[PDB]
Design a protein around this ligand. Structure first.
Ligand SMILES: *[C@@H]1O[C@H](CO)[C@@H](O)[C@H](O)[C@H]1NC(C)=O
Lengths: 50, 99, 49
């Protein structure tokens, strides 16, 4: 405890995210609505929009 | 105002043992990177030592204006080199006032 | 748990002691790095071994 500020212990947690084309298993909370076809709509399929 | 210049020449420099000497966070370099200081090599190394306030640390930089930069210690606009600063409360401060 | 001077080594494309010999992050790394001080829990006057 008598050491300087640059020699203090630091707890490190590193989160690495797999940004791949596998089916999605873990992500954030968004409510899913009904799917409508043959209409010009805005879609959100597993994160990417259009 | 009366900072010390030390000339370093004719030796082999190890820049990985600097972290064990002083407890600093950032090895803030400008013209080079801290992780590439051991492969390439230079002609001469010059070290300037002074003790300033915590609000004045950001003025040790090229193209800066303030009090220390324009009147006490000026860095050039084409400055290659590296700046090391760390807190010194436990050694350079007194309850009666450090004058 | 690492020391405070080598927190900057936990980054893509770094060279040092933790990055070269202990824990290396890839060049195309994506994600977040979280680090906080742990002086209250991971420090002892006798010396941690
Ligand atoms: C600096 O010198 C003093 C006295 O010679 C010594 O006690 C101290 O450990 C030295 N600093 C380092 C980082 O070795």
């Amino acid at each position: 405890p008598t050491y300087g500020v640059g020699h203090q212990p630091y707890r490190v947690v590193v989160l690495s995210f797999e940004l791949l084309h596998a089916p999605a298993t873990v992500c954030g909370p968004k409510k899913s609505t009904n799917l409508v076809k043959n209409k010009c709509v805005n879609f959100n399929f597993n994160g990417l929009t259009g | 105002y009366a900072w010390n210049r030390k000339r370093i020449s004719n030796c082999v420099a190890d820049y990985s043992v600097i972290y064990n000497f002083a407890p600093f966070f950032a090895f803030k370099c400008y013209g080079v990177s801290p992780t590439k200081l051991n492969d390439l090599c230079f002609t001469n190394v010059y070290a300037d030592s002074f003790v300033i306030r915590g609000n004045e640390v950001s003025q040790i930089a090229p193209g800066q204006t303030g009090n220390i930069a324009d009147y006490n210690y000026k860095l050039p606009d084409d400055f290659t080199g590296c700046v090391i600063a760390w807190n010194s409360n436990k050694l350079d401060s007194k309850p009666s006032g450090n004058y």
